[PDB]
Amino acid sequence: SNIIKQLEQEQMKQDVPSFRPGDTVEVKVWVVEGSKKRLQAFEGVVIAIRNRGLHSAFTVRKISNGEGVERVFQTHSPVVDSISVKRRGAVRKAKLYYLRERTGKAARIKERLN
């Protein structure tokens, strides 16, 4: 409005990489030990929703032990550090919210841009 969009960017990290979701990603997040900080891996797969001017989602399913643990990310919070795009594909439908329970020899991701 007139009180944000000129007082909002200050907190956005816009300098991140961009994808269409469905990727092999390796998120590096600050884990703090109370003594020291370090960068903990979250190899996953983004299902991401698009940005709201300040709020995003980049929920990853780990598939940690065959069963994933899931962590949404945002890239505005200063402790998120850095996210690699690595390999990049995508499902034909852009939102993944149930194509992540598809499974049973699914992982196929692909690119077009057209």
Partner: peptide, 14 residues
Amino acid sequence: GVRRPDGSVIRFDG
């Protein structure tokens, strides 16, 4: 799961 406000929610599906 568990949650700490910073847009990080760790949700286990187990």
